[PDB]
Amino acid sequence: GAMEKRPRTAFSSEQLARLKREFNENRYLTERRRQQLSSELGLNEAQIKIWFQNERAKIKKSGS
Numbered sequence: 001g002a003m004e005k006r007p008r009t010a011f012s013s014e015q016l017a018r019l020k021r022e023f024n025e026n027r028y029l030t031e032r033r034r035q036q037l038s039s040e041l042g043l044n045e046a047q048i049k050i051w052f053q054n055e056r057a058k059i060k061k062s063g064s
Contacts (some may be wrong), residue, residue, distance in 0.1 A: 011051070015041050023055050 003027055009016075018041060029037075034045050 009051070015043075019051065023052065027056055028052065 021039070022037065029048070034048055037043070037048055038045055
């Protein structure tokens with residue numbers, strides 16, 4: 001069943017582990033950079049763009 005009562009990312013702990021280390025250093029990406037992560041964890045550009053779009057939108061504090 002494709003229905004769920006909580007938001008949930010269709011990704012692995014092995015695969016979010018290296019994604020966390022690029023999100024912590026820059027909050028965005030460029031076309032030239034998308035293709036590096038896409039070759040190094042085997043995802044499409046659509047999936048990477050969206051992942052970096054919505055990780056911003058969960059984290060509303062960054063100023064102290």
